[PDB]
Enzyme design. Structure first.
Site, PDB file in Angstrom:
ATOM      1  N   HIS A   1     101.912 -10.597 -72.318  1.00  0.00           N
ATOM      2  CA  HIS A   1     101.157  -9.835 -71.327  1.00  0.00           C
ATOM      3  C   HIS A   1     101.643  -9.905 -69.870  1.00  0.00           C
ATOM      4  O   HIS A   1     101.386  -8.982 -69.088  1.00  0.00           O
ATOM      5  CB  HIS A   1      99.699 -10.249 -71.414  1.00  0.00           C
ATOM      6  CG  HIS A   1      99.123 -10.073 -72.779  1.00  0.00           C
ATOM      7  ND1 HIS A   1      97.877 -10.548 -73.132  1.00  0.00           N
ATOM      8  CD2 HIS A   1      99.622  -9.468 -73.881  1.00  0.00           C
ATOM      9  CE1 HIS A   1      97.634 -10.245 -74.395  1.00  0.00           C
ATOM     10  NE2 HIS A   1      98.677  -9.588 -74.873  1.00  0.00           N
TER      11      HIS A   1
ATOM     12  N   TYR B   1      99.742 -15.281 -70.983  1.00  0.00           N
ATOM     13  CA  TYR B   1      99.707 -14.798 -69.607  1.00  0.00           C
ATOM     14  C   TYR B   1     100.699 -15.468 -68.678  1.00  0.00           C
ATOM     15  O   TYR B   1     100.807 -15.084 -67.510  1.00  0.00           O
ATOM     16  CB  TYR B   1      98.301 -14.922 -69.025  1.00  0.00           C
ATOM     17  CG  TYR B   1      97.295 -14.063 -69.752  1.00  0.00           C
ATOM     18  CD1 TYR B   1      96.619 -14.548 -70.872  1.00  0.00           C
ATOM     19  CD2 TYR B   1      97.078 -12.734 -69.371  1.00  0.00           C
ATOM     20  CE1 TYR B   1      95.757 -13.733 -71.601  1.00  0.00           C
ATOM     21  CE2 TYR B   1      96.221 -11.908 -70.095  1.00  0.00           C
ATOM     22  CZ  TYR B   1      95.568 -12.417 -71.209  1.00  0.00           C
ATOM     23  OH  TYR B   1      94.742 -11.623 -71.955  1.00  0.00           O
TER      24      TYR B   1
ATOM     25  N   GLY C   1      90.368 -13.695 -74.559  1.00  0.00           N
ATOM     26  CA  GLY C   1      90.494 -13.801 -76.001  1.00  0.00           C
ATOM     27  C   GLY C   1      91.862 -14.384 -76.341  1.00  0.00           C
ATOM     28  O   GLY C   1      91.979 -15.260 -77.199  1.00  0.00           O
TER      29      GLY C   1
HETATM   30  C1  LIG Z   1      86.804  -3.856 -75.290  1.00  0.00           C
HETATM   31  C2  LIG Z   1      87.358  -5.266 -75.320  1.00  0.00           C
HETATM   32  C3  LIG Z   1      88.559  -5.541 -74.655  1.00  0.00           C
HETATM   33  C4  LIG Z   1      89.136  -6.863 -74.648  1.00  0.00           C
HETATM   34  N1  LIG Z   1      90.312  -7.035 -73.963  1.00  0.00           N
HETATM   35  C5  LIG Z   1      90.867  -8.269 -73.946  1.00  0.00           C
HETATM   36  C6  LIG Z   1      92.090  -8.490 -73.190  1.00  0.00           C
HETATM   37  O1  LIG Z   1      92.648  -7.608 -72.559  1.00  0.00           O
HETATM   38  N2  LIG Z   1      92.628  -9.790 -73.211  1.00  0.00           N
HETATM   39  C7  LIG Z   1      92.004 -10.854 -73.936  1.00  0.00           C
HETATM   40  O2  LIG Z   1      92.551 -11.909 -73.891  1.00  0.00           O
HETATM   41  N3  LIG Z   1      90.857 -10.671 -74.598  1.00  0.00           N
HETATM   42  C8  LIG Z   1      90.255  -9.436 -74.638  1.00  0.00           C
HETATM   43  N4  LIG Z   1      89.088  -9.261 -75.310  1.00  0.00           N
HETATM   44  C9  LIG Z   1      88.429 -10.410 -76.012  1.00  0.00           C
HETATM   45  C10 LIG Z   1      87.364 -11.076 -75.082  1.00  0.00           C
HETATM   46  O3  LIG Z   1      88.044 -11.547 -73.913  1.00  0.00           O
HETATM   47  C11 LIG Z   1      86.673 -12.243 -75.817  1.00  0.00           C
HETATM   48  O4  LIG Z   1      86.024 -11.726 -76.979  1.00  0.00           O
HETATM   49  C12 LIG Z   1      85.604 -12.903 -74.919  1.00  0.00           C
HETATM   50  O5  LIG Z   1      86.191 -13.423 -73.733  1.00  0.00           O
HETATM   51  C13 LIG Z   1      84.920 -14.018 -75.675  1.00  0.00           C
HETATM   52  O6  LIG Z   1      83.823 -14.625 -74.737  1.00  0.00           O
HETATM   53  P1  LIG Z   1      82.341 -14.647 -75.133  1.00  0.00           P
HETATM   54  O7  LIG Z   1      81.567 -15.268 -73.969  1.00  0.00           O
HETATM   55  O8  LIG Z   1      81.906 -13.432 -75.606  1.00  0.00           O
HETATM   56  O9  LIG Z   1      82.170 -15.532 -76.256  1.00  0.00           O
HETATM   57  P2  LIG Z   1      81.976 -15.496 -77.864  1.00  0.00           P
HETATM   58  O10 LIG Z   1      82.936 -14.641 -78.590  1.00  0.00           O
HETATM   59  O11 LIG Z   1      80.684 -15.459 -78.264  1.00  0.00           O
HETATM   60  O12 LIG Z   1      82.499 -16.824 -78.263  1.00  0.00           O
HETATM   61  C14 LIG Z   1      81.933 -18.081 -77.785  1.00  0.00           C
HETATM   62  C15 LIG Z   1      82.347 -19.197 -78.777  1.00  0.00           C
HETATM   63  O13 LIG Z   1      81.702 -20.426 -78.238  1.00  0.00           O
HETATM   64  C16 LIG Z   1      80.554 -20.777 -79.091  1.00  0.00           C
HETATM   65  N5  LIG Z   1      79.473 -21.013 -78.121  1.00  0.00           N
HETATM   66  C17 LIG Z   1      78.594 -20.078 -77.600  1.00  0.00           C
HETATM   67  N6  LIG Z   1      77.709 -20.599 -76.744  1.00  0.00           N
HETATM   68  C18 LIG Z   1      78.014 -21.942 -76.693  1.00  0.00           C
HETATM   69  C19 LIG Z   1      77.406 -23.093 -75.931  1.00  0.00           C
HETATM   70  N7  LIG Z   1      76.393 -22.987 -75.121  1.00  0.00           N
HETATM   71  N8  LIG Z   1      78.006 -24.332 -76.146  1.00  0.00           N
HETATM   72  C20 LIG Z   1      79.089 -24.490 -77.005  1.00  0.00           C
HETATM   73  N9  LIG Z   1      79.708 -23.507 -77.742  1.00  0.00           N
HETATM   74  C21 LIG Z   1      79.137 -22.243 -77.557  1.00  0.00           C
HETATM   75  C22 LIG Z   1      80.348 -19.622 -80.051  1.00  0.00           C
HETATM   76  O14 LIG Z   1      79.744 -20.020 -81.268  1.00  0.00           O
HETATM   77  C23 LIG Z   1      81.792 -19.054 -80.224  1.00  0.00           C
HETATM   78  O15 LIG Z   1      82.596 -19.664 -81.187  1.00  0.00           O
HETATM   79  C24 LIG Z   1      88.444  -7.939 -75.357  1.00  0.00           C
HETATM   80  C25 LIG Z   1      87.211  -7.667 -76.042  1.00  0.00           C
HETATM   81  C26 LIG Z   1      86.654  -6.357 -76.038  1.00  0.00           C
HETATM   82  C27 LIG Z   1      85.364  -6.156 -76.776  1.00  0.00           C
END
Ligand SMILES: Cc1cc2nc3c(=O)[nH]c(=O)nc-3n(C[C@H](O)[C@H](O)[C@H](O)COP(=O)(O)OP(=O)(O)OC[C@H]3O[C@@H](n4cnc5c(N)ncnc54)[C@H](O)[C@@H]3O)c2cc1C
Ligand SMILES: Cc1cc2nc3c(=O)[nH]c(=O)nc-3n(C[C@H](O)[C@H](O)[C@H](O)COP(=O)(O)OP(=O)(O)OC[C@H]3O[C@@H](n4cnc5c(N)ncnc54)[C@H](O)[C@@H]3O)c2cc1C
Lengths: 273, 273
Positions: B161, B155, B149
């Site tokens: 971090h 990093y 995220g």
């Molecule tokens: C409990 C918890 C702890 C966390 N801890 C951390 C941490 O320590 N450090 C940190 O950095 N982050 C942290 N996060 C955040 C997390 O890393 C991000 O929310 C996550 O990596 C986002 O990846 P995702 O695959 O879910 O994508 P999504 O949030 O869904 O985002 C994907 C994005 O790409 C688009 N997309 C989707 N599919 C496609 C496709 N096929 N082609 C083109 N575009 C597309 C979507 O519309 C969206 O904008 C944490 C989250 C939670 C819930």
């Protein structure tokens, strides 16, 4: 000075040393007039997995579901799952949070991890604005009581597994420091499967006695936020000046901020400098 | 050279980039004639928590229950929970295991951690006799595809971090190297919530293309077991001679074996030396 303390236990068996270590602490804190709250995760049959069930009512955008946003919002809107709130109420009251658990795969237990991932909600537990020494929990103190299967030597600098400090870093600086907590020295018990009956008791005694003055110990040293330009502009980097000065230093600051230099020492194991 | 590959996904939403990254890989490997096996943990509704249910039949000693022993024994006696075996059959077939997941609390997802803690059984996944480069999986290759995220800068060595290499260490050396795996360079995608629509595609394209030659990449460097007296006698320490020699080296070996010196570089991020 003394008040409420939360003890989170991650162990299925009541016959384990981890459970012993649990009662010991409880018994100890109580004698010193504390008020102990407990979250025996395995007992509570606590739910570790994170999903769109942690939220109540309209999911805002249940199309392109995103947990980070959907949950911090559910939080402010008080639409969070009841079992998750139950914990928040505990955290809100605890002055000292203690985590008891057996080291598993160089980390925290699955069930515990989940508690982190589910309980520590953005907006409550942390905020890009309120990170590390600005974290919401800066007034609370926390420490880790771990049980290892391997031997102490295995984790020494010349051990098979490597520096134990590295292992703790992600947990102590990454989760606890992040949220604001004051991280106290970790209670490390190596290989209890090897320690004899005697030592086990003396270990429980040491534990108890260490708790008589937990609230007065100094926390571990983590690099202060002041050293950074905390903004999406600079990219949250160590300030140029600070880098400038740091150049004259032979040692790095902390395990994660080794800055390419030699890592201090038990920066993550012993509190001092 | 090419054959079976296992892709373990730890993400609840099918609309996530992590799911995209998943289909991409699958699609890619298949074109190159691979045979892909999948373990969509959230989908399978996989069970993360470890308990005495992972075992079938008489629990030997259901009095002073101890999971490490009770399980490795249930393993040899083929009395392991069916869902756990299902995975084993996959692992046994996979030549390349790929883990796709969003970085969460500086680590792996709760549900994923559980898979580790439950699937990687002693006797199958590892043995004090068969550790690291002696591990059972030394013939299989693995890598981590992570989604963060935060931003890349966060990093960096001068980031808030801290060094990303430290973060990966516990996972790559602690779990995967431990078991025997050849750990390839990790696929790091920082903040996709900020990357624009274009980049996202090019990232998926890069992914795809990198897989056309995964089996031919060099693995990350981990300190070889030869450097240690792997016995409960010596305590699994870096051999005196090796310490002797290593004294003339300015750099440490790996993140965990920094030996108090300066940590190499992207020892955990880039495969080379
Ligand atoms: C409990 C918890 C702890 C966390 N801890 C951390 C941490 O320590 N450090 C940190 O950095 N982050 C942290 N996060 C955040 C997390 O890393 C991000 O929310 C996550 O990596 C986002 O990846 P995702 O695959 O879910 O994508 P999504 O949030 O869904 O985002 C994907 C994005 O790409 C688009 N997309 C989707 N599919 C496609 C496709 N096929 N082609 C083109 N575009 C597309 C979507 O519309 C969206 O904008 C944490 C989250 C939670 C819930
Ligand atoms: C999935 C998994 C991953 C693991 N990964 C690692 C790893 O990476 N590194 C590692 O080092 N280890 C690892 N382990 C091993 C684990 O760390 C140990 O099994 C655990 O720490 C032992 O603690 P325990 O509380 O369960 O105690 P138990 O195993 O129950 O042992 C406690 C001992 O003390 C005795 N005892 C119990 N209660 C009391 C009391 N009140 N007073 C006196 N004596 C008492 C018991 O009879 C027993 O001999 C792993 C285990 C699993 C299942």
């Amino acid at each position: 000075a003394a008040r409420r303390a939360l003890i989170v236990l991650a162990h299925s068996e009541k016959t384990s040393f981890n459970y012993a270590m649990k009662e010991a602490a409880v018994e100890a804190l109580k004698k010193r007039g504390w008020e102990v709250l407990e979250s025996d995760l395995y007992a509570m049959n606590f739910n570790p997995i994170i999903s769109r069930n942690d939220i109540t009512g309209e999911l805002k955008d249940s199309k392109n579901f995103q947990y980070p946003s959907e949950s911090s919002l559910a939080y402010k809107e008080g639409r969070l799952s009841p079992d998750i709130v139950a914990e928040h109420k505990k955290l809100e009251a605890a002055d000292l949070v203690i985590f008891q658990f057996p080291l598993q795969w160089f980390g925290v237990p699955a069930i515990l991890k989940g508690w982190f991932e589910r309980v520590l909600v953005a907006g409550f537990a942390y905020t890009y604005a309120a990170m590390y020494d600005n974290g919401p929990f800066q007034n609370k103190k926390t420490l880790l009581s771990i049980t290892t299967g391997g031997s102490g030597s295995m984790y020494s600098l010349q051990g098979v597994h490597g520096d134990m400090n590295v292992i703790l870093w992600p947990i102590q600086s990454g989760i606890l420091r992040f949220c604001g907590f004051q991280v106290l020295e970790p209670q490390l018990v190596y290989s209890i499967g090897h320690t004899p009956p005697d030592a086990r008791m003396q270990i429980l005694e040491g534990w108890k006695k260490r708790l008589e003055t937990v609230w007065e110990e100094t926390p571990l040293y983590f690099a202060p936020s002041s050293l950074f330009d905390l903004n999406f502009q600079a990219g949250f980097l160590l300030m140029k000046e600070v880098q400038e000065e740091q150049k004259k230093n032979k040692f790095g600051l902390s395990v994660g901020h080794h800055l390419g230099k030699s890592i201090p020492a038990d920066n993550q194991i012993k509190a001092r400098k």
